[PDB]
Swiss-Prot record:
Can degrade fibrillar type I, II, and III collagens. Ca(2+) 1 binds at residues 53, 85, 87, 89. It comes from Homo sapiens. Belongs to the peptidase M10A family. This is Neutrophil collagenase. It is found in: Cytoplasmic granule; Secreted, Extracellular space, Extracellular matrix.
Length: 158
């Protein structure tokens, strides 16, 4: 069970996707972290530069980690479990269409999914859970953590 033994975690958005504005990208990312926050003791702080616990980058194909991305559709992103260095980090395929809408793919929902992984959650078999292996759009306005996911971080932390 890898878990962060610290509660306030910093994150850094290393670059951006041209699909969305930077403000929309930053809002998608911020709201995704807030979901886990309201159900756990973790507090997340954005830093503009510098080492951050959770680095967030939009990369393409080979991007230095032995987990190359694959062009449109297919794998949308991946994150690493709690740890130093790459631990906790989250990469998004820069080749996907990232959206703010119901169109494929909504960055907020994919981000929320990746962060569960950065906090030490794996995939759930529950199709209604956010940690479900495959993406499905769900209304994002006043969006809240499904009970399955709530049970998962709460079993890791408090
Ligand atoms: C290549 C492996 C790690 C699959 C990858 C994933 O689950 N990352 O957490 C992924 O892109 N899964 C697809 C099926 C996806 O839509 N994931 C994000 C989602 N659940 O929102
Ligand atoms: Ca890290
Ligand atoms: Ca892809
Ligand atoms: Zn990667
Ligand atoms: Zn996943």
């Amino acid at each position: 069970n890898p878990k962060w033994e610290r509660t306030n975690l910093t994150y850094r958005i290393r670059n951006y996707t041209p699909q969305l504005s930077e403000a929309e990208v930053e809002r998608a990312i911020k709201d995704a972290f807030e979901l886990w926050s309201v159900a756990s003791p973790l507090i997340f702080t954005r830093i503009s530069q510098g080492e951050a616990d959770i680095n967030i980058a939009f990369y393409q194909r080979d991007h230095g980690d032995n987990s190359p991305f694959d062009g449109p559709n297919g794998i949308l992103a991946h994150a690493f479990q709690p740890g130093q260095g790459i631990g906790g980090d989250a990469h998004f395929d820069a080749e996907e269409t990232w959206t703010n809408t119901s169109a494929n793919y909504n960055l907020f929902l994919v981000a929320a999914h990746e962060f569960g992984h950065s906090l030490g959650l794996a995939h759930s078999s529950d199709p209604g859970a956010l940690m479900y292996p495959n993406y499905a759009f769900r209304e994002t306005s006043n969006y809240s953590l499904p009970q399955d996911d709530i049970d998962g971080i709460q079993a890791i932390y408090g």
